[PDB]
Design a protein around this nucleic acid. Structure first.
Lengths: 294, 102, 218, 58, 169, 159
RNA sequence: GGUUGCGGCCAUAUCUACCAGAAAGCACCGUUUCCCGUCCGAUCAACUGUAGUUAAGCUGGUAAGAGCCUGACCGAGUAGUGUAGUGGGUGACCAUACGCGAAACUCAGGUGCUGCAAUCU
RNA sequence: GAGAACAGAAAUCUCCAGUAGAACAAAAGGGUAAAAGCCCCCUUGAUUUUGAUUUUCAGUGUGAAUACAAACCAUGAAAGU
RNA sequence: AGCUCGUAUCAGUUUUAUGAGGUAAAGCGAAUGAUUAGAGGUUCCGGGGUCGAAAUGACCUUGACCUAUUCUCAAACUUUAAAUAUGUAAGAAGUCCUUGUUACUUAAUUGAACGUGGACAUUUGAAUGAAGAGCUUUUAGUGGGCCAUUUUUGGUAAGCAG
RNA sequence: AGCGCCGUGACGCAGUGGAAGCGCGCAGGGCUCAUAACCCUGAUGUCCUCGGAUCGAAACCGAGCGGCGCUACCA
């Protein structure tokens, strides 16, 4: 009884947009971000989109046209292992690293990379990529976090700091990077640098090693296999920063197969829609079985 | 044209006038306020508000209403006197007594 | 005790119904709309006879009521209360205004006339057209000339030139006779108290077979 | 003593005597109401290009 | 099959609907935080009536929401004071349930003379996973009718635990 | 009393639409507008800032000025005996383009292509449009297509 | 062709009830020391990707499905309407000429398409 | 709708549906669903200089409103507003 | 009264293309408001009449609610939606190619606005007509209006009022 | 015909959005041989009826029902 909505209700019902039905966007924010000062006619508004799954991070540089959004760059925790990280592909430091990576990707593909090098010697301080004199200005980009909770001490702002150190002009403020003492409005660069090179993760490693070896075996199992510890992780993070600054040029996979083979297996195994004649067969079978009186 | 006969309220004095029905005549912005009552000092009546204990106020109206109220205060039991504030010459006009919410 | 229908006959003014703006009307005198054996069924009363209009006018609740009484009187007198179903088919929602003047000699001094012309309600009325049916009935061919006499009397009570018509249809349905009969020796029908439910070629086969079984068991 | 309150009668005939003339369109229209940022840059640019063309053909 | 459509609890909640505001409400809050170990949350009115003698925004109630092993411990303690016997008439239409009682100190409370006696409304929300698939910000969704919960499966699980029966209707 | 306000007799006019309430789609913002562009004006009642007047509802004009979230539009307006130029600072939610102008520009560049072909061969373009001219003779056959004689149907009441 | 991220048009895309899901990606899920926020690590912040499940979310298919969309040589040139007549009629109204032309209904069909980037037997 | 002592039709709490059937100072009409509604946090852009424009219209004024410029600010991670 | 030019920087018009409207008409087994009558159910279910001690026990009647149905309506209701009226375009002040300016804008000689130089003619961008096209100054009279077709408000109605 | 007012216990008359006042009348006890008076006590008001706004009205705004009042002049 209760499982039957009304004809008039379902008729007069207005759907939302697709992404809102899927629970994935806030068009308020999307409008505010992609909409542009109409004195700057075709010059885009460059978003740094960031999104967070389980077991991955996504960071993309995106613009907006009438047929669909258009991309310049990308960065992925699942391609970081070229540059030398194997585990913890969703942490604050990998987020920072992805931001650094996408920054170097943009400045590489546009030749803005020799000038506005960015930052290599890192300490954890607030400074934006102020422009050069008598030369091209740095790339202006605005963050887009979708639906994610703006909150002090997040991997999104970690990625932001990665971009700002990699050489992107993103506007921001230092009042959400972790170590931002609330009452005394000053940031703590040493705690921030600790989170860069893995402070909190090393604290967790240390405590598991001193008290809970059964959990130390259940997780960090890859660290047991690879023989990692609380100074190796800093050294590999530093060397990975160097490798990102060295060769960001996106060698992709080889795909192990071909497009039409992937499609051949999917289409072969696929379902298909039951046509008009076999619909007639279905109703006719119902008739001959049941309306034929068994 | 309208003949009007009205009682002065702070004094008790009759006032008859007359003027055309369509001409404008002034009216003040009379207000009653329902103030509670505490221990009476010298002739000044003593009324408090819900959010203020101010108002060494309107000075004990001498009428038969006033005398009965004076007698009524001798036997107590929460005395809410009502006043009015027309053109800032305040005075007490009526009264009510509590029976519940002790 | 009313003003004449000649004063309130034509559609001189737009529809003025009861609403949240008027809120206050004098109710009708008609209150009954179906009479006779209304609980009869579709094949029970095959003949359907009508009363239609060739004018375009307003008809009062008073005329509807008196015509109801005259027609029902004829049928229940001569052929009995359970040989027919009568149904009126126009509801009075329109409202009629009057600028109530005086009925004295010496009203000159206080009338004020057309200043304040917007009148108050003093009744209701219907609004009909060409072909818009006023009355309908369902009964049998034995009762045919009787019931059309009743509608004749109702004609004599209403104003204007109204016609009586024997439809090609079976009862109050939108279906004609032989198609109904082939349907009924078939099985798309299932009688309600007054109307009937049909078999759709659309929708739930399960509900149709839950209903209408013999047509599938042809 | 009441009167005829209002009517638009004969006004369109009066207009269409010598009536509904289009506004005179001009090359180089008014730059009032236009964005002053654009006015300023446009001024300096036209000054520069006039100077430049006279120096190209002096 | 039954991989992880196995049943469990989402939450317990404890409500106290004090007749008025005041020291009584403070004492009810003290009782709830003494049991829970965590501070409670008050509850204001919605509208006005004199039969109970109330007004709008007059601080009528308090409650708490708790989870996990502590919640199920309090639950089974409620059951043993309730002599492991309940009603399908008391049971709701979803499998979720609860019961309102008196004499709160029965749960193992170190009574104080100040607080007095207070009756309560216990409520229990059971589920399977997807709780955050309905209650998060991204990729929201309404669960499958299979993964939904009902009177019959919830009471069958709840009966085979403790082998404790209920009434017919 | 008589009431003549900025948003009077506007109910069904600033009614948004059926099954299109709520927010606005994004091509309204990603489109572009320049001086000399011709544009239409329909008003989005969901955006109560930057609105036009109901006279200017459903009308057409030319741009003269462009700002942050808004556009200048010129309109000609009958006031008594003249057409007045009227300047409006509207919002792009209320603006959209003129497909008549779009199709005109496409016809223009196609005309240029035809002139290019006639620079290649000198073959008498006859560029101008011409109306639906009256049609020329032909021969209809009869094979499988014999003429059915028709005549009216009598009057049946059909009730 | 499948999946993920950012999308354009914003129901052929929704709703209801089931059925299925190779791989991979998502997701469910595991944990509270760290930044952080709650009555509550449920939401949110942080850590692992380990323990496990494709059950739910998600994707697709079925329903003489509801809803939505399209088409008709279906209704219907009907209802309505522009222009003309010293046309008809007591009048309401109607017919004719030159013209435009509905909606409901009836029947037939359809149930998302597609852009940028990455990924998958 | 289905429950939960007192507690009932109406006290408080929880689950499911819920395209708006509520709420937005008021009259009525439009508009709005990760908001313009409800709650929370911070503020005083309800600021200065004056021009352009729309409505009523004589293209006069008053009133109201719109979009920019030069400043100084608020809020927000930021676009922005 | 003229003034500047000489067939066009026009048109109470049609066509092509593109917009906007929410009135006629239509609908209410589509929302809101009003309304007629049945049936079939749910009675932890309004009133009850009975079997009985009573029993969410059983039956019967009668008002609700639910299901699908039917009849009639809306100037201040509406999914839909005309006819007639209504905006704009139909090029030279234009299109394309190249590069000059700038304190504006861009990550950027990227873009915007206005230009240099060159190319595109007889069909220079649909029809028809143009009795000259445009522009100023000054001033009279007038500011009681009425009648007809069609639409329409108030009023029973009026050579009524609008 | 037009406009305005008023409807509070059995009765008369006050009553101001946080929630009914007085007098008479009525009932009970005591004094009186009994009633009156007297002394001690208590109770009774869908605030004409319906709907609305309001968190909630007797009050505030429409509908109706009833009892009244004022207009009614120049001819």
């Amino acid at each position: 009884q209760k499982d039957a909505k009304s004809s008039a209700y379902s008729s007069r019902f207005q759907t939302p947009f697709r992404r809102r039905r899927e629970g994935k966007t806030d068009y308020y924010q999307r409008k505010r971000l992609v909409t542009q000062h109409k004195a700057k006619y075709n010059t885009p508004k460059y978003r740094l989109v960031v999104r967070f799954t389980n077991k991955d991070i996504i960071c993309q540089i995106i613009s907006s046209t009438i047929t669909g959004d258009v991309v310049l760059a990308a960065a992925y925790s699942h391609e970081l292992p070229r540059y030398g990280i194997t585990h913890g592909l969703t942490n604050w430091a990998a987020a920072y690293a992805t931001g650094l990576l996408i920054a170097r990707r943009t400045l590489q593909k546009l030749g803005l990379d020799e000038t506005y090098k960015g930052v290599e010697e890192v300490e954890g301080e607030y400074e934006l990529t102020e422009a050069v004199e008598d030369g091209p200005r740095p790339f202006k980009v605005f963050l887009d976090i979708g639906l994610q909770r703006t909150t002090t001490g997040a991997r999104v702002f970690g990625a932001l700091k990665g971009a700002s150190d990699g050489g992107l002009y993103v506007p921001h403020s230092e009042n959400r990077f972790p170590g931002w003492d609330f009452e005394t409005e000053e940031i703590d660069p040493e705690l921030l640098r600790s989170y860069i090179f893995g402070g909190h993760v090393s604290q967790y490693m240390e405590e598991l090693a001193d008290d809970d070896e059964e959990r130390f075996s259940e997780l960090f199992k890859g660290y047991l296999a690879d023989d990692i510890d609380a100074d190796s992780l800093e050294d590999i993070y530093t060397s990975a920063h160097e490798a990102i600054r060295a060769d960001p040029a996106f060698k992709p996979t080889e795909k192990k197969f071909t497009k039409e083979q992937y499609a051949a297996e999917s289409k072969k195994y696929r379902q298909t829609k039951l046509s008009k004649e076999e619909r007639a067969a279905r109703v006719a079978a119902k008739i001959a079985a049941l309306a034929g009186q068994q | 044209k309208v003949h009007l006969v009205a009682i002065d309220i702070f004094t008790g004095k009759k006032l008859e006038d007359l003027s055309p029905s369509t001409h404008n005549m002034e009216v003040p912005v009379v207000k009653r306020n329902e103030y509670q009552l505490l221990d009476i000092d010298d002739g000044f009546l003593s009324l408090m508000n819900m959010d203020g204990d101010t108002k060494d106020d309107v000075k004990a109206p001498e009428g038969e209403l006033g005398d009965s109220l004076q007698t009524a205060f001798d036997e107590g039991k929460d005395l809410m006197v009502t006043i009015i504030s027309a053109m800032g010459e305040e005075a007490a006009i009526s009264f009510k007594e509590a029976a519940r919410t002790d | 005790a009313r003003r004449p229908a000649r004063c309130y006959r034509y559609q001189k003014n737009k529809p003025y119904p009861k609403s949240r703006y008027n809120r206050a009307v004098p109710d009708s005198k008609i209150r009954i709309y179906d009479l006779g054996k209304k609980k009869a069924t579709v094949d029970e009363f095959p003949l359907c006879v009508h009363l239609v209009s060739n004018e375009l006018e307003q008809l009062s609740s008073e005329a509807l009521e008196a015509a109801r009484i005259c027609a029902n009187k004829y049928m229940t007198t001569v052929s009995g209360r359970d040989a027919f179903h009568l149904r009126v088919r126009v509801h009075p929602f329109h409202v009629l205004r009057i600028n109530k003047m005086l009925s004295c000699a010496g009203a000159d001094r206080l009338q004020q006339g057309m200043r304040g012309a917007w009148g108050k309600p003093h009744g209701l009325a219907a609004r009909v057209d060409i072909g818009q049916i006023i009355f309908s009935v369902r009964t049998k061919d034995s009762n045919k000339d009787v019931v059309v006499e009743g509608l004749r009397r109702a004609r004599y009570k209403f104003p204007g030139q109204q016609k009586i018509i024997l439809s090609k249809k079976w009862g109050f349905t939108n279906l004609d006779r032989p198609e109904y009969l082939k349907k009924r020796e078939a099985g798309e029908v299932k009688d309600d108290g007054a109307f009937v439910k049909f078999l759709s070629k659309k929708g739930s086969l399960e509900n149709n077979i839950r209903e209408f079984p013999e047509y599938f068991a042809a | 003593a009441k009167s005829k309150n209002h009517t638009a009668h004969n006004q369109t005939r009066k207009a269409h005597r010598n009536g509904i003339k289009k506004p005179k369109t001009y090359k180089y229209p008014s730059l009032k109401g236009v964005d002053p940022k654009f006015r300023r840059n446009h001024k300096h640019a036209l000054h520069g290009t006039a100077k430049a063309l006279a120096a190209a053909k002096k | 099959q039954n991989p992880m459509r196995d049943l469990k609890i989402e939450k317990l909640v404890l409500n106290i609907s004090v007749g008025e505001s005041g020291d009584r409400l403070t004492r009810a809050s003290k009782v709830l935080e003494q049991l829970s170990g965590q501070t409670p949350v008050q509850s204001k009115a919605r509208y006005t009536v004199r039969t109970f003698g109330i007004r709008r925004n007059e601080k009528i109630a308090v409650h708490v929401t708790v989870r996990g092993p502590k919640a199920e411990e309090i639950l089974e303690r409620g059951l043993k004071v309730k002599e492991y016997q309940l009603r399908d008439r008391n049971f709701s239409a979803t499998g979720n349930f609860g019961f309102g009682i008196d004499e709160h100190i029965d749960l193992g409370i170190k009574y104080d003379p100040s607080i007095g006696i207070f009756g309560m409304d216990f409520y229990v929300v059971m589920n399977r996973p997807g709780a955050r698939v309905t209650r998060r910000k991204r990729c929201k969704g309404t669960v499958g009718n299979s993964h939904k919960t009902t009177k019959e499966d919830t009471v069958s699980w709840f009966k085979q635990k403790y082998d404790a029966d209920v009434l017919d209707k | 009393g008589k009431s003549h306000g900025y948003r009077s007799r506007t109910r069904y006019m600033f009614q948004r639409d059926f099954r299109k309430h709520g927010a606005v789609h994004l091509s309204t913002y990603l489109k572009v507008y320049k001086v000399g562009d011709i544009v239409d004006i329909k008003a989005n009642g969901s955006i109560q800032k930057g609105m036009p007047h109901k006279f200017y509802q459903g009308k057409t004009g030319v741009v003269y000025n462009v700002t942050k979230s808004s556009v200048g539009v010129i309109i000609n307006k009958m006031v008594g005996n003249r057409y007045l130029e009227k300047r409006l600072n509207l919002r792009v939610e209320h603006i959209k383009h003129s497909k008549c102008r779009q199709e005109f520009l496409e016809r223009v560049k196609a005309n240029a292509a035809k002139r290019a072909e006639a620079k290649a061969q000198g073959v008498a373009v006859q560029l101008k449009r011409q109306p639906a001219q009256p049609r020329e003779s032909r021969i209809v056959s009869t094979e499988g297509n014999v003429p059915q004689t028709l005549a009216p149907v009598p009057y049946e009441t059909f009730i």
